[PDB]
């Protein structure tokens, strides 16, 4: 009178064992590589077909699991970790996501996202069924093998991060041809230099090329991107620590507060925008559609440097909600993380671990000072960085770098542990 709903659908799903084995990185090489091959093959396989060469996949596994992590609010998961539920909060996602992906797939098949709803053949519905069902479920079971420590943890993270590696840096050097309507031009912005040199005496104009190209845009965007990439490592590496008792310490997690929110913060705005556009003083839009009137236009993000030059006053309105959500609407993620004082306290009691100096019991009041304050520069300024980069134009980076390079950090400290085993030996 929903945990009862788990029973009819649970352990039927395949699962995999844990190893009773001392597996090393050199040994894990392959098992990682498999995941790489699979994901990349999905990336690189599908005028409209030509544009396509240049649609759920991973995204359901993210969104469904995070949604369940939000539904953990109102103490709902305080049913609490036990052998009888030793993974079933995850297991629920394993089916709920699966069916939500199938629903989405059917909805766009009914839409006919590509193709009229019968004349190309109903068999393509079967095709899309198998395609997405297989793809998504295999991808998930990859991430499971990695979390099972045949790898390291999340794969999907690393996967999207690798996609970001390509979709950023590929544009630096890809020698693939482009045409303006002038003749032979190249995708890889940098190397064009060497052919320009054979083309023109006009070195100054060859350099201004680094500042012009409006599509697959000019190097100056890359240079900004590089600078952002370099800088952020400074911020992310910082961390703080407390002594712990049954010469050992608990590292207070810091930018862990940054990890979750920005997805939601960006999404909510983007989606309400989309909604208002579809439903329609509130907002009116020009051709990628963009706002050009109503409140949504006063609200619109002034990404263009032209927007700077035309009016500075507008930008405050965008800042007010975009940053203010980081300031205040984020505060509720104590429940989403499940890391209020009386949550972290419970967790540490399960750990059965206590600090020096004062009582376990009053440690609630002790840690309270640190708990809200973590939300400040630990979170909001990563949004400020994101917007910095985006309005400087760092290519796709104000989403990507934030997670991708953090994952590089995690992989670095793993790489340190294992390869430092090599270096010590």
């Amino acid at each position: 009178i929903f945990l009862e709903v788990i029973k009819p659908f649970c352990v039927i799903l395949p699962e995999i064992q844990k190893p009773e084995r001392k597996i090393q990185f050199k040994e894990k090489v392959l098992w990682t590589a498999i995941t790489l091959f699979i994901f990349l093959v999905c990336c690189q396989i599908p005028f409209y077909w030509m544009r396509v060469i240049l649609e759920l996949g991973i995204s359901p596994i993210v969104t469904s699991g995070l949604i369940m992590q939000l539904l953990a609010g109102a103490k709902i998961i305080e049913v609490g970790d036990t052998p009888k539920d030793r993974a079933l909060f995850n297991g629920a996602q394993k089916l709920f996501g699966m069916i939500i992906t199938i629903g989405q797939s059917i909805v766009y098949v009914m839409t006919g996202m590509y193709g009229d709803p019968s004349e190309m053949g109903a068999g393509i519905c079967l095709l899309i069924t198998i395609q997405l069902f297989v793809a998504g479920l295999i991808v998930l079971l990859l991430d499971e093998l990695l979390q099972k420590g045949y790898g390291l943890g999340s794969g999907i993270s690393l996967f999207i991060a690798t996609n970001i590696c390509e979709t950023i840096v590929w544009k630096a050097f890809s020698p693939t041809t482009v045409n303006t309507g002038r003749g032979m031009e190249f995708e890889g912005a940098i190397i064009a230099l060497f052919h320009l040199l054979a083309t023109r005496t006009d070195k100054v104009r060859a350099l201004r090329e680094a500042f012009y190209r409006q599509n697959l845009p000019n190097l100056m965007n890359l240079i900004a991107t590089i600078f952002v990439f370099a800088v952020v490592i400074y911020f992310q590496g910082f961390r703080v620590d407390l002594p712990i008792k049954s010469y050992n310490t608990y590292p207070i997690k810091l930018f862990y507060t940054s990890n979750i929110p920005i997805i939601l913060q960006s999404a909510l705005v983007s989606n309400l925008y989309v909604i208002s556009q579809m439903l329609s003083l509130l907002g009116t839009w020009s051709d990628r559609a963009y706002p050009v009137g109503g409140l949504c236009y006063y609200l619109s993000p002034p990404e263009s440097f032209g927007s700077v030059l035309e009016d500075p006053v507008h930008a405050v309105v965008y800042i007010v909600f975009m940053l203010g959500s980081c300031a205040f609407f984020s505060k509720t993620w104590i429940e989403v993380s499940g890391s209020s004082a009386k949550d972290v306290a419970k967790q540490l009691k399960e750990q059965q671990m206590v600090m020096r100096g004062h009582r376990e019991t009053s440690m609630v009041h002790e840690l309270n000072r640190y708990i809200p304050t973590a939300a400040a520069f630990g979170g909001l300024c990563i949004g400020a960085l994101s917007v910095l980069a985006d309005f400087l134009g760092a290519i796709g980076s104000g989403t990507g770098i934030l997670l991708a390079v953090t994952i590089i950090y995690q992989y670095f400290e793993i790489f340190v542990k294992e390869q430092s085993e090599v270096g010590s030996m």
Partner: peptide, 21 residues
């Protein structure tokens, strides 16, 4: 042992559908 053939084999075989389509 078999996880490699679990996760890879069916997918690389599932190439065939778009091979013909």
């Amino acid at each position: 042992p078999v996880p490699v053939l679990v996760m890879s084999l069916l997918f690389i075989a599932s190439v065939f559908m778009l091979h013909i389509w």
